Structure formats: C-alpha cells, structure tokens
Design a protein around this ligand. Structure first.
Ligand SMILES: Nc1ncnc2c1ncn2[C@@H]1O[C@H](COP(=O)(O)OP(=O)(O)OP(=O)(O)O)[C@@H](O)[C@H]1O
Ligand SMILES: Nc1ncnc2c1ncn2[C@@H]1O[C@H](COP(=O)(O)OP(=O)(O)OP(=O)(O)O)[C@@H](O)[C@H]1O
Ligand SMILES: Nc1ncnc2c1ncn2[C@@H]1O[C@H](COP(=O)(O)OP(=O)(O)OP(=O)(O)O)[C@@H](O)[C@H]1O
Ligand SMILES: [K+]
Ligand SMILES: [K+]
Ligand SMILES: [K+]
Ligand SMILES: [Mg+2]
Ligand SMILES: [Mg+2]
Ligand SMILES: [Mg+2]
Lengths: 524, 524, 524
C-alpha cells in the first residue's frame, strides 16, 4: 500500500508528541504521592493502578506517526520492568527528557549522531556512578524500606517481604498472591511438598482430615507405571516383613493393585500411601531423582537395568514423615544423603545458568528451593477486588525492589542519587561539541526523576530540586514528608539495579530516537 | 486501538456522573416506602422489582467513562448482595455518598490517597461500632421482624421464615420456591428422602398412589450394578427366610433381575423395592455411606474386597419404614447407629470448611440436614407472574436478612444505627488533616441511608434526620409509619452483618475511587 | 448495552399509553355488538376475529416503554384465556380501567403501594361477591344460553354444546372442529374405538366397506411383538377349537404370521382380525390394560411371568363386537368386569390429580371417557375459510363458557353482575386513605365491562349504566336488544369462573403496574 512519510522536523514533532503523551500518562503515578490511573476494561470492571510500565503498555494514539513513536518509547518502561520490575516510571521520564533535549539540540541545526554518541557516553558514566553510589541493602530493615518505597510507602509490605526471604532463605522461592480476607499473610514450606494426593481414600489413616500419613516411609521411586502386585510381591513382602509404611511415588498404581493395597491397609499387612511421581516426563524423572537424593533411595527405571520385581527395601527411598492429603504429599525430612541434595541442586543451578527461558531457570530454582531450602508464599488480602489488584501490584513492585536491592544495593531514593550522579558528570565532553551537547542533553535529563516525584507532591520541583542539589550525597527530598534530608536515613531506598536499568534503557532508546530524519508509516 | 484518555477533574466528573446515575437508579427502592422499577426484558414480559443490587446490575451508560465508573461502583451492591443478600441499596447509597464527599474534598486541591486512608480508618471504626451495636436476633419474633423489614414490611414472610428454621432446625436447609396457588407454603422433610423411585411398578404395594412401601426394610447398599439374580441368591434367600421387605439402594437393578424380583413380589417370595443410589460417583458413595450410617448397613463395594454374593442380611441396611413412590424413596427412621451419622456429618462439615465453592459446602450442608436434622421448603403464591417474582424476591431477601440477623444480630433499622455509629466517631482524626478530611467524608456519608429511606417516604430527610439524631440508640424514624421511636421495638430490624458488609464494600470501593487521576478507555 | 431509563411520571405515561393501546384494540370485540378485527397474515389471507385475547396477543409497539407496558398488560387477557378461556376482553377492559384510575391516584401524589394493597383488598372482596352471586348453570338450557352469549348471541352453538355434553356425559370429552359443508355437526362415540385398523385386507369380512368385524371376539392383549405362529399355536388352536373370532391387539403381527392368519381366514380355520395396540409404551400398556379391564382379559407381557405360548382363551380378552376398518378398531361392548373399568379410570383420574401438564390430564381424562363414558365431537361448517375460523373460535369460546358455567354457575351478564358486586363494596376501606383510594379505584373500574359492552352497541354507557345501576340483581342492559331487564331470564349468561378469573388477573397485574417508579430498557 502507499505509505505515509514525514521528513525532517515533522517526523521529530510527531515523535515528540507521541513520547510526551506516553510519558505524561506514565509519570502521574511516580513518587510516594503519585496518583492512580483508572484503566477501563472492555470485559469486566476497570482496573486501578499506580504502576508505571502498566500505564505505559496501554498507550496508543490514532495518529500513526505519534502512535509508532509512542510504540518506540514504550520500550523504555517495558525493558525497565523486564530487568528490575520497578522504577519504570523513572525510566519513562528519563527517556522523555533525553529525547526532548536531544531533539532540541537537533533543532539547533547540528548532528544527531554525535548527540547519540555523547548521550551514550554520559549515560554510561552515569550508570557507573550509580553503581559506585550503590549502598548494599541486605538487612531486612533496608530491604523492608526498599519494598516500602516501591509499594508506595507501605512499610507492612516491605516488612512482610523481608520476613518472607528470611523464612524461605536466599535459595528459596518467594511468591506474592491474593488471600481470601482483607489482610496479607505469609506461609513458608520446607522440604518436599508435591501435589500428589493419595490414589485411594482407603489409605487415609486420619479421616478427620481425609489424609494419609506415613512414618519412616518406604519411598518406592518407580519411573514406571506400577500395575500388578506380582511386580510388588518381593518388595511388598519385604515391606510387610519390615512392617514400616511404604510410600508410592511412581507414575501410578492400577485399580487392582490399588484394591489389593487398600484392602491390606485395613487388613494391617502394609500401610501404603499410593501417590504419583511429581513432574511429567523429563521433569518427572527430575522430581523422582530429587526425591531419591533427599530420601537416599533409587529411582526404579528400566533402561538402566532393573525391575520392580527386582526392587527391595534398598531401592525404596526412606523418609522420616510423609504426609499425604487429598492433594499434597509432603516428604518431611527424607532420610537420605544431603550430599546428593547439594550435588543435585548444583547440576540444577548449572541448568539454570544454561536455562535461557525464565520458566526453565525458575523451575530449576524451585527444584533447588524444595531440595535445598524452602518455599514461601505471600498471600495478600483486600475487601474488594480493585483494591486486591492495586495492593497486590504494589506488593510485587515491593518484591522486585527488595530483591534488586539485595542484589545490587540501594542509593539515595526519590530521584536524588541521580541528581548527585549528574553533578558528578558536569564535565564530560565527547568527540566534538556535538557530542558535548549530547552529554549536556543527558545531564539535563538526569534530574527529571526527583523533579517529577516532587511535582506529584505539588511542590516547586525547581526550588525543591535546587535545595536538594544544595546538599549532596543522600541529602534529598522526602517527597511523602515534603522535607529534605538523607534519603537513606528515613528509608527512601531504591535498588541500584532499578535505576541503572531504567537509565540504560532510556538512553539506548533516546540515542536512535534523536537521529531520526526519515520516518515512514502507512496511509491512514 | 487508539484509546480515550482523560486527566484531572474531567476523570472525577465522569466517575461521579456514572456513580450518581447508578445510585439514583438503585435508591428509589430503599426503605419500606421504596417504589418498584420495571426492568424491560427483550424476551418475555418486563419484570418488576424492589431489590437494590438487582437494579444496580442492570445499569450501563453509553458514555464510556461514565459507564465504566458505573462498572466500578456496581461492585458495592454486587458484593453487598454476595455477602449478606440484603441491604444492597444501603450499600449503594453509602458508596455514592462517600465517593461524592471525597471527590469534593479532592476538588479542594488536596491529597486523595490520604483521604482514602482516613476513609478506611473511619469506616473500620464504624464497622466496629455497628458490630458492637449488634443486638442478637435469634428468637422467631425478631426473625419475623427482620423478614418483615427486608420483605418490604411483610410480617407473613418473616413469620414463615422463622417457622421454617423452627421446623427444619438450624443445621437443616430452608428454600424459598414457587407455589401453584395464590399463597405461600412451608414444608419440612425429615430423614433422607432421595428422588430414587421404584425401578418397577410391579413393586408397588399401594397402586392407589402408585408407590412402594417397605416396613423394616433390608437396605442392600450396593455401589455396583446388579447384573444377575445369581449375585442375590445369598441375600434374597436370606431375606425370603427373613421375610422382611428388601429395599435395593444400588447403582441399579438389571431388567432380568428386575423381572425376577417383580415376579417374586406377586409370587409373594420377597417384598422387593428396587431403587437407585442417590448421587453419582463420589456423591453417590457419600449418599450410600449416609444411608448406611442411618440404617446400620454397609455400602457393598469391591475395592474394599468383598462381593455381592458374599453379602448377607447384615450388609443389608435396616430401616423402620421406607416409602418409595414413582420419584422419591424416603428412608423414614433408618434403624441404625446415629453416632456414625454425626461422625459422617462431622467429616461433612470438615468438607464444608474446606469447601470453597458455595455449591460444595451447600451439598455437604444438605447432607448434614438429611442425616442430622431435616429439610424445609418455602413456597410462594401469586395470581400473575410479576407479582410472583416481586413477592418471591422479597421473601428471599427477607430470608437472607433473617439468617444474617441470626448470625450477627440486628441493630437499629432504617438508617438509624448508622446515625448512632457516625455520632460515635465524630472525633476520629487520621495521620494528616488530609486523613482527617477523609474521616469526615466517611462520617458525613454515613448518615445517608436514613435520608434516602425517609425521602422514599416523602418526608424532610433534613428535619426528620435531625429529629432522629436528637434521640439516640434505637430512637429513629419509623419510615413506613412516618414516626420517631425505637427501631428495635417497632419491628424495624436490620442485620448487623448486612450493614457491616454494605459499609465495608462501599468504603473499599470509594477509597480507590477518590484517588482516581486518569481514565483510559477505547475511543468511541 | 447502553440502557434507556425512564423515571417518574414519564414512565407512568408510557405505561398508560401502552395499556390504553392494547385495551382499545381489544375492547372493540366486547359484547354481542363487538366489532371484528382483520389481523393480517404475512402468509395466507388474514383472519377475522371477535375474540379478546386473540386480539390482545398480537399487540406490539415500537416504543419500548409503551411496548413494555403493553406486554405487562397483555398478561391479563392471556391469563384470563388460560384460566377460563372466555371473557378475556372483559379482563383487559377491567385491567385498563384499574391501571388508569390507580395512575390517576398516584398522579395526585399519594402512596402507590398502599393503592395496590387497597386495590387487592377491594378486588378480593369483589371476587367473593361474584362467587356468592354465582347462579348454577348445569341444565342444557342455561348451558345453551351461556354458549349463545359467548358465541356472540348464537343459540345454535350453545344448544349444540349442551347436546354434546348430553350425548357424551360429563366424564366424556367434547371437541369442536371444523366440518366439510356449510353446517356444524355433533358426533358422540361410546366404548372402545382406537385407530388401529386391520393389519391385512384379507381379514376384511366386508369388502363393500373394507372393514373387519368380529363377534364375541377373543382379544389377545399381547404387550409384545407377535412374530411366529409357533408362538400362537396354543392360542390359535384354542381359538379354532373355540371357533370364536380372534382379535389381536398387540404391538404387531409379523408378515409370516399375518400371511398364515389371513390364509386361515378364507381357509375357514380362524376368523382373525390383527390390529395394533393403541398407544406407545406406557400409554400403549395403559390402553392394553383399559381393554383388559373392559373385556375381562389379561395383558400378555413377559415380566409378570407368562408368555404368548402360555396364553389361552382366558388371556384372550372377550368382547361382544369389535368393528375394525382400514383405520379404527372399535371394541363395542367388551364383555368383561366393569369394576376393573372404574378402578382403572379411578387410577387414571388420580394420575390427572398429579398430572401437571394439561396434556397429561387430557390424555388421562380421555382414557376415562373411553373406558367409562364416551367421546363427543363438534364440527364447524360454512361456505368459506375465514368463516371456518370465526365460527370455530366462537363455538370454542362458547364451549369454554358453558363448561365454566357448569363448573361455577353463572351471574348477571353484560357486566351487570359486576355492577351489583361493586355496589356491594362501596364501603370498603383499607389501612389508610391510600388503601381506601385504591379500593375506590377498583370500585370505579368495576363498572367498565357493561359500559364498554353498551358502547360497542352504540348507546350512552353513562345513561345506560346509570339505569342499570338504578335496578339491581339481574336488572341490567340487554346489549344486543338495547333494552334493560333481567340478565338471567332472557338468556344473557356468563360463567362466574370467567368473570372471577378476569377480575383476579386484572387486579394482580394492575397492583404492581401502579406502584412502579422507574423503567430500564435498551436504547432504541
Ligand atoms: N517517601 C518517599 N520520599 C521520596 N521519594 C520517594 C518516596 N517514596 C518513593 N519515592 C520515590 O518515588 C518513586 C516511587 O514511585 P512508584 O513506586 O510509584 O514508581 P517507580 O518505583 O518509579 O516505578 P514502578 O511503577 O515500576 O514501581 C521512586 O523513584 C522512589 O525513589
Ligand atoms: N418500617 C420501617 N421503618 C423504618 N425503616 C424501615 C422500615 N422498613 C424498612 N426500613 C429500612 O429501609 C430499608 C429497607 O429497604 P429495602 O428492604 O427495600 O432494601 P434493603 O434492605 O436496603 O436492600 P435489599 O434490596 O438488598 O433487600 C432498610 O434500611 C431498613 O432498615
Ligand atoms: N345480549 C347481550 N346482552 C348483554 N350483555 C351481553 C350480551 N351478549 C353478550 N354480552 C356480554 O358481552 C360479553 C360477551 O361478548 P364477547 O364474547 O364478544 O366477549 P368476551 O366474553 O369478553 O370475550 P372472549 O369470548 O373473547 O373471551 C360478556 O361480558 C357478556 O356478558
Ligand atoms: K509508578
Ligand atoms: K431496596
Ligand atoms: K370478545
Ligand atoms: Mg517502585
Ligand atoms: Mg432488605
Ligand atoms: Mg364467551
């Protein structure tokens, strides 16, 4: 089809318009006094959000040029959320400021490519200064403060998140979800707990709970479908002679074998709980070997060279307690070597490092968390459901900030460390005065976050930012409190990863955003 | 698609317009003198209702922003009906009042999120004051009065409701349904009566009713398909020797054994009634175990490890009387261990507490009702159908309010206890003057329900509400009578649960409603 | 979708407009001088009708709100036809008058629900007065008069209807159909006559009519398929030895068996007429048992414990005469126990009592009428097809009125007994002046039927109704004769059921029609 092309300043005007629209929509939610953006939903009820990339990803314009400029500027918030999951509004504001200043420099009749070169130089130096200005955040206090700041000044959320990684450990998994009531809560799970309920309620030794519990159980790890008691005659006779409970973690147990086993349960012969092997296929064998490592047993497999009729007490993994309910089979203290546990989680972490999909690395990380540490779950509560969504989003922003602050540390919060960094780079010069103008573009843009945070509080971002710049280090502006002081002190803490990724993506977008000369869309 | 985005006071104006439209439609039905609304039906004749959430759920606007604002405000009535099933119009009125006052506060150029914090603080205190002001409603008189008030001043409805729980007991089930004549009706059923008619009319011992009746029956509980009489030669010989009637509650009886048994019936060998096991699968096993508990029998199964040919008189459950008609089989006074019934319904109640779906907990509650107490049914009568719908809806609203009043007690009805509670909180102050103004928003909005109830009666809500506030406690306005006095005494009873849930949901919506800054919807 | 909402007096005006349109279309057919309405048929020629509910059910309005009110007011005529099948125009007129007067009362600013309460009170009293004013219509004279008035002053129709129940008896069934020529026809059928012609023409003992007739027939009631003579060797040998004609009422007789039987018919061995068992399944067994009761025979079925090869003369039911033609098999005077006939029809009437569908009770009443009484048919003859339609509908209205008058009696015709009833209620007062005004609304609306009937006759409904009210009892206005005088004596009779149901449904609709405040409908 015939295309629609804008050359020269017109293309830049469309770009600035789209970028400004998207950034104006995003930035109203920045800072502790940022407000919420109500998003209509064609299906169901509208949502209420204060997240930056959430607002950014919903922005499209009817003007094709402005729309696709907004499409290119949405990448800043999208990638900032992708990296750190927080500070997306700061990324959008910084990108818009860099783009505007660089376009103004282009409007002076000078090379945009050297503007991009200088912008990249200055922002690289600024990211370095942010990383060097990083102060570690590994104490649950500062972690809770970081989560607070990214939960829109919510101390309870950051506190609960710090308690969550405290309960689960560093190698454990922390999850934020909804609770049923109006209040949030945290639960941590240690050892193995896999959602494989008993394959028959007749195994239930505690009908008041509808659950099976086995003590010092024999965990027959069968990477096979358990069918005929003739397969289990040697092993189940050996277990009845042993008398201790046997736990079935296999592909399944058939109806006739299940009938024999259940009958024997109230015949008193064998106290067996039949459940399935967690995972499916490769992950099924992964869980099977995981349980074997925890319980010191062997996975009954056929291609390796043994049979179920060859299985005896030794092939049976051994645990201390295995609680089976209608859904979960919790191997509590699998009686087996820890050494195979660390070796398994080591191969698992090697897989994580070789896992490109976040899904793969996360599944393997959860394999570690079950096998090595624990699993913690945060439930969040609210009376209504828009409150549910907003509070859960804030709690997960807090989670992202807490983890990133554990990762890289923190800096002076509220866009103040960026002001310090910009003060640290007022001297940088590129290859030509054009690259120097690009550096000045970046430097002028670096003070936008605090100014926008303060503007969301309704002060003078000019006067307030000036007073903040008057002090240095962590001296800033407590935007929620409307005061100046050490941003680290009162707990205005932002992860260095958050700000660094935001700045990097903002500059990387703005560098090519400035150098646009020919812009083509389709005809409307 | 290109979106339609709004900022500033325009967003709040659109929110307020949609919310006001929805609440104005809702509140014409509040109070004893509330009027009805005809809802047109594209299919069939239009309907007439005085319910609040029913009117609320039908409201949508052509204006996208106002329409979706109505979408978020409809949540108040929807959730109030979900929790309490009554007082939904009061919830809508309270939500609209809080929203309007908080938006007015925002219009003063002041912080909305602190308004939300103060509103939540004041409303939590108000819910506490309401619950502390709860007076118990467990006697049939106060139940009748609650049903009266929530059936639009209909004493017959609340009376029938109190009589219903009196007949069925508290663990029993009460249902409001349609009657054929011009009048309401109440029926209670004891024991199990399960809709499993005789599998053959030749079993009918009373053809004048076309029904089978067995006395001291042998209840063969066989969770298996009867396939040949050869399966029943042990039990049928044992019963012909016993001579007492045998009742079959099995999976089914095949046609050949059915023919043999029917022949034996007029051959006089065994007095047979063949019916099926109520439920299907797991619920079928549940019903079979229930019948076994009451009748002192055992469900014939093969996984447990025994055959029907192995069954004898003992495996046949025993009752006092079992009446089988073309549809139902009523095990009247199953002669068997009650203790197993209470243990069974205890496991059933454990399931109820572990039943998240209302369907699951309700099925298990009915299992309790049949096994422990009884089952009650309320009918309703009318000449035409719009009358039928309006009356039955009033009866069910009254049922919901009576049960909520049994649960949490009652308070001063007609928007009066809310006035007392608001008077109890005139002092509360939040974190800042912003939260204080939010608390005052909540306090000012708390008194709206009396105003709307009085206005639906056509008085001066100002002067009448002032006179109501002049007295306290249960002194208020008898809106139907258009007089002042004790709300509790004059039969003006509203459940504390109803008002508490209404207030909670109204405030929880209004809190984020106030903090709205931007709207994003599709372009029209 | 975006809704169209009407509040207050706009909604009331739209309701009244729809009601008025529907009632104006209906009432032109009221009285002996009601005028006919051509209803266009998109397929075929339009019809000409003087029926009230027939005109009412065709009313559709483009205005959603007027159409809404019209749909709610159509219920009056629909339910009046549903209950009594007659006097539907009177129901529509009464409902319109009550609605108009109640809307006028509400337009005075007074409480609508109390108006509904008073209207219901007054109409309940009026229905009681109508029932107390009922004078029996059981003799053929008053039946003919009721039919005449409800056949729009057609004595032939009511006469034929009285003759119809005279020929068929009260337990019998009267049916009105159209005839072939220009004259109506009445036919009565007694005993058994089921449309099961001979299975083969070689059974025909009278080729001049193509019919089979058996004298003292042996009725083989086989609830089974009859296949091979080897099944019938005992039966047919027993018949040939008995020499009596053998009538087979079974599922069928197979082609080889039929060929052998037909051969034997002109071989002189057995005079067999093979016909099928009337009904299908349960109703087939019901017909078989009815014939067994009438003919003193036994139904051959396997599940009781006998076989066709076990059948002999005793299992062969016995009749006096069975006339079989190409279609029907008429067991005329089945010689057998009448006691089982009355017991069976008593069970069938029991089934009527727990028959929910009108089809169920109709089937069962026809079973009784065949087995106990008779069956009657009324034809409708005329030169053309529109005359078919009009005459048949008129005759069936007359039939409905005659039966309802046999049921509850009659009252003064032409809306005069209603005038007397309203004169008997001029004092009723409700709980408040609002209920009193509702009662007065009902009383004022009560005189509408006579006034509209007279207006259809072209007199002064004012002066005429005033003169009617001046006299009392049966003194009224002979609308057809344009004269005053006794309604009962000169043959103006209407069922008390018709008027009572009409008034009840009119008030039941109008009660909620008055109290509505608001409308909800889709946008046009
Ligand atoms: N009490 C406070 N005083 C000063 N600055 C604060 C305060 N609380 C938060 N901030 C700053 O404001 C921002 C927090 O706002 P918000 O959490 O809504 O957005 P974000 O962290 O930039 O992005 P995201 O939408 O991805 O979570 C951060 O830049 C933080 O440093
Ligand atoms: N006779 C009365 N005197 C005073 N207040 C009354 C009287 N009857 C009802 N009320 C009050 O008016 C309201 C009853 O109105 P209505 O029953 O139509 O709606 P609701 O209870 O708010 O909600 P729902 O539509 O869910 O049933 C309640 O707030 C009740 O306390
Ligand atoms: N000769 C008459 N004198 C007085 N009133 C009469 C006379 N004939 C009929 N009526 C009255 O007119 C009505 C009968 O007319 P018509 O059969 O057309 O209407 P309907 O009975 O209301 O309607 P439908 O049979 O369609 O339900 C009755 O109210 C009857 O009392
Ligand atoms: K944000
Ligand atoms: K209401
Ligand atoms: K008519
Ligand atoms: Mg944040
Ligand atoms: Mg109510
Ligand atoms: Mg008639």
């Amino acid at each position: 089809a015939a295309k629609d092309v804008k050359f020269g300043n017109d293309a830049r005007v469309k770009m600035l318009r789209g970028v400004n629209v998207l950034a104006d929509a995003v930035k109203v939610t920045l800072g502790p006094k940022g407000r919420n953006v109500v998003l209509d939903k064609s299906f169901g009820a509208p949502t209420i959000t204060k997240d930056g990339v959430s607002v950014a990803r919903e922005i499209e314009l009817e003007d094709k040029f402005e729309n696709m400029g907004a499409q290119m500027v949405k990448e800043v918030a999208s990638k900032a959320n992708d990296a750190a999951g927080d500070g997306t509004t700061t990324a959008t504001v910084l990108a818009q400021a860099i783009i505007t200043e660089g376009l103004k420099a282009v409007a002076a009749g000078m090379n945009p490519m050297d503007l991009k070169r200088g912008i990249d130089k200055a922002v690289t130096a600024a990211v370095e200064e942010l990383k060097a200005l990083s102060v570690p955040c590994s104490d649950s206090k500062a972690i809770a403060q970081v989560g607070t700041i990214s939960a829109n000044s919510d101390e309870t959320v950051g506190k609960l998140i710090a308690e969550a990684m405290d309960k689960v450990g560093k190698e454990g998994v922390i999850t934020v979800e909804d609770g049923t009531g109006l209040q949030d809560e945290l639960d941590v799970v240690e050892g193995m707990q896999f959602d494989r309920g008993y394959l028959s309620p007749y195994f239930i030794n505690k009908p008041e709970t509808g659950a099976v519990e086995l003590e010092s159980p024999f965990i027959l790890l069968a990477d096979k479908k358990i069918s005929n008691i003739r397969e289990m005659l040697p092993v189940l006779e050996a277990v009845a002679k042993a008398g201790k409970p046997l736990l079935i973690i296999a592909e399944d147990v058939e109806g006739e074998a299940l009938a024999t086993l259940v009958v024997n349960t109230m015949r008193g012969i064998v106290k067996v709980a039949a459940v399935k092997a967690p995972g499916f296929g490769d992950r099924r064998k992964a869980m099977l070997q995981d349980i074997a490592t925890l319980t010191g047993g062997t996975v009954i497999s056929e291609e390796i060279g043994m049979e179920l009729e060859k299985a005896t007490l030794e092939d049976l993994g051994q645990a201390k307690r295995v609680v089976i309910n209608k859904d979960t089979t919790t191997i509590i203290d699998g009686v087996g070597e820890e050494a195979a546990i660390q070796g398994r989680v080591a191969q698992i972490r090697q897989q994580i490092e070789e896992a490109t999909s976040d899904y793969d690395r996360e599944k393997l990380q959860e394999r570690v968390a079950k096998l090595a540490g624990g699993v913690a779950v945060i439930k969040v509560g609210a009376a209504t459901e828009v409150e549910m969504k907003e509070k859960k989003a804030r709690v997960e922003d807090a989670l992202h900030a807490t983890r990133a602050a554990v990762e890289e540390g923190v800096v002076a919060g509220g866009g103040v460390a960026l002001i310090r960094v910009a003060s640290k780079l007022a001297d940088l010069r590129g290859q030509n005065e054009d690259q120097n103008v690009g550096i000045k573009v970046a430097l002028r843009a670096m003070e936008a976050p605090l100014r926008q945070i303060v503007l969301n509080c309704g002060e003078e971002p000019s006067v307030v930012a000036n007073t903040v710049k008057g002090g240095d280090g962590n001296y800033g502006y407590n935007a929620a409190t409307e005061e100046y002081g050490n941003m680290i002190d009162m707990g205005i803490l932002d992860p260095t990863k958050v700000t660094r990724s935001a700045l990097q993506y903002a500059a990387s977008v703005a560098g090519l955003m400035i150098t646009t000369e020919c812009m083509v869309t389709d005809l409307p």
